[model samples]
Target: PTTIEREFEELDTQRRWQPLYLEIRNESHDYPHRVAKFPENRNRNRYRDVSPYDHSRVKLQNAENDYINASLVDIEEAQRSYILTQGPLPNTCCHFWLMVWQQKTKAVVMLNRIVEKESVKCAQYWPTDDQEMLFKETGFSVKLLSEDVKSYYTVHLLQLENINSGETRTISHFHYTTWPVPESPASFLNFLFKVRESGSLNPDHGPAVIHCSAGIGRSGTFSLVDTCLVLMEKGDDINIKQVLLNMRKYRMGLIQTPDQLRFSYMAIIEGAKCIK
Candidate 1:
C-alpha cells in the first residue's frame, strides 16, 4: 500500500477525517470576489456566497462586461485545467454556451440533474432528442445528435453551431444522473473512468467544463480526484490536502462539506490503485 492508503486507513479508523477537513477549510485563503458582487453581474451567479475569485475567474471574450460565474482552475503540476462554474441560470444559458464556444471545450461534465430535491438545480441548456435549442442572444444553436443512457449516467453527443460564423463543433455531454449532491466510491470512480475513456480531460483539449448545482461541491471532488490521479500516474509525489487547498484558491467553498472532503480522499485512494 502507498502512503496515501495508509493515511486514509488511519484516518478512517480514528475518525479524524472531519478535523482534517475543517483544518484545510479554515486555512484556505478567502480572496476578493468584488466583481461577482457587482449589481450588473449579480444575476449571472447561481449562488450569492459562491463566487469565483477575481484573479482566476474566467473572463468572457468580446463582451461588454466580461463576467461569468466561472473560474479557471489550472494545476500546472498535473498538467490539468478545468473551468468550474455554477449551474446556468435561465438567463445565463446563452452566456454558458458563449463561454463554451470561446473556450474550445470538448466536453461538459454535468454532475447534477435539471431538478433536484423538488427544486431547480440547472437550466435545460441542451436540446432534446432530434431537437435544437437556439440561443439567439449568443448566436449559437445546440442540436442533440445522439444519446447513450446508462444505468446511472447518460452521454449525449451535441453539435454546437456558431450561427454567425457558420462553424460547428461536436461536444460530449457526460451527465452523471444518479449523483444527487453525493456518491459512493465505486460508482463514482466508474463514472470518472468513463469520462477518462473519452479523452476529454486530456491536456491537448481545452479545459473541460464541470458543474453541479453550486459547482464547488461535486465539481471540486471530481477535479481534485482526477488531478491527483494524473499526478500519481506520472510518478509525482502528491499531497492530496495541499492539491485541494491550491484548487480552492481558484474558487470558494470547494468540497462544501466534510463528507465531500472525505469522499475525495476515498476516491483518490481508489484511483491511485490503478496508477502503477
Candidate 2:
C-alpha cells in the first residue's frame, strides 16, 4: 500500500512534522512483477499453503532495514526460527536493527513505562500490552544508541501529553486527503531539502544514518520515493535505475518494492513522471 498513495489534507508550510510512518505490510511479492493481492475468492484460499520461501506477496525482501513486519497476523505476531517461520515471526536476519514503535494512543503508556527516567522495567523483556511490547516507529524522541545495528535501533515511542487537543495519532493508520498521501510527506520532504540544501556535513554535522529491518524494501521505498519526488518536483526526472542504484551505494535493495520499481511508470501515468 506504500505505492498506493493515500489522500492527504493540505499540510502547513511552517509546522515541523515527522513524515516517515509505520504500517503493517500485509502483502508481499517474490519478483519485480510478483505482487500478490489479498485473495478475492474468500471461500477458496490461494496461498493458504504458501511458504514464504520463493514466495512474493507484496513486501520487498530487503526491507529489514525498516520494520516492515517480516510477519504479523491480524496486524499482530509469534513464531519459529528463521527459514521456517510460522505465524508472525520477525526476521532473524542480522541486517535488521530492532526498533520499537508506539501508537500515539499508547504513547503515554510507552513513555510512562519505557521512557520514564525512573522506569521500573528493564529495556528488554519489559511488560507491555501485546501490541505495545514489540512495536517500532518511523521516528520519535529516541534514546539514541550507537552507530551499529547491534547497538543502534531508533526506538519510536510517541508521547501525547496533550490529549485535550485531539491528541493520539497512529502514523501508519493516519489518513490524508490529497495526492501522494504518505503519512507526512511535507516533513519527509523538508528533511531531504535540508540535506541537499545544506549539501555538506562532517561526522559532527554528519548525515543521519537510517535503516529498517534490512538494507532495502519499504525502508528503501520510503527513502527513495521521498527523494525522487523532490527531484521530480525540481524537474530532475529521477529514474528507478538511478534511485535504486544510488540507494545501493548506501545499502542495497532499499528501493526493492515492486511498486517502488514501477514507481516511475505510475508517476508518469499521473503526469508527474521523473527519471529516464
Candidate 3:
C-alpha cells in the first residue's frame, strides 16, 4: 500500500468521493469574492490571480491602510479557527506582525520557505536566536528563543513583544520545509502531529495562523486535514468534501490542485482508521 499505485487504487474505490469532489469544485466558482473591485488589494497580493473576500478580510488595528491578504476561517461548530494568509510581501511584513499581535496568535504555521523555485515565496519574517528582527512599521520586535531542525521540518520558539507596551508572549513557529503541491500525505501527517504535540493548535489557544505562497493551496490542505481529524476524533460523522467547501466559503480557492485534493482524501482515510 506504500506504493503510489496501490494507494491511489484504494483511493479510487472510495465510494462517493469523486462525486463529492466534483461538487466542491463546481461550488468554488459560485463565490462573489471578486478581486477586480478591490484596487487597494491589487498590489498587496503576491499573486495577481488570488484575492481575499472583501467582507471576510481580516483587518489590522491602528493601521490607517485597510490592506492585508488574510481571512478568518472560523468553524464554530467544530471549534476550529485559523487566519489563512498569503506569504507577506516585502512591504506587508509589518502588517503581518500587526495581525498576529492583534489576533493574539499563539503559533504561526509556515508552509513555504523564504524562497522557492528561485522566486521569493515569503519574507524572512522571524529572527534567529542571536539576532533580532524588528518590524519598524508596526512597533513590534521578534526574537528567536530556540530552534530544532529536521530533514523535512523545523520548530522555532519565538518571543513577540510590543514596543509600546513592553509586553511579550511566546510563539511556537512550525515550519514545514517540504513542498506542498506533491508531497505525500503520510509525510505531512507526521508534521501535523509534531505541531499538535506543541499544543499550539489547541482550540483553547488563539487560532494558529497558517500561510503559504498564496495562502490557499498549502494553507487550505493543512486546515482541511486537521479539521477532518478533529471531527473524526470527536466521534462525529465527517464529509471531507463538505468541510473543505465550507472552509472555501471563508477563504477562496483552498486545495488548489487535484493532486492536493487526492492527497487530502488519502490523509483523511488514514486518520479515520487511526481513531477507529
With a 3 Å backbone cut-off (N, CA, C), the pairs that clash in candidate 3 are: none
Model 1 deviation from the true structure expressed as Cα RMSD, one decimal place: 1.2
**Residue 52: error of model 2 in Å?**
24
- By TM-score, the better pick of 1 and 2 is 1
Q: What C-alpha lDDT, on a 0 to 100 scale, does residue 252 get in candidate 1?
A: 85
Worst 10 residues of 3 by lDDT: 1-10
lDDT against true structure, model 3: 0.82
Top-lDDT structure, candidate number? 1
How far in Å is the alpha carbon of 180 misplaced in model 3? 5.5
Candidate 1 Cα errors over 4 Å, as ranges: 181-183
Per-residue lDDT tens digits of candidate 1, residues 105-215? 999999999998889999999987686798998899999999999988999999999999999999999999997535568888889999999999987888999999999
* Best-to-worst ranking by lDDT: 1, 3, 2
Model 3 earns a TM-score of 0.89
Cα displacement (Å) at residue 245, model 2: 1.0
* TM-score comparison, 1 vs 3, better candidate: 1
**Model 2 weakest 10-residue run by lDDT:** 73-82
Model 3 spans > 4 angstroms off:
1-22, 29-37, 180-183
lDDT of 3 by residue, 35-73 (tens): 424777676788877778877778887677767889889
Residue range with the least summed lDDT across 10 consecutive positions in model 1: 179-188
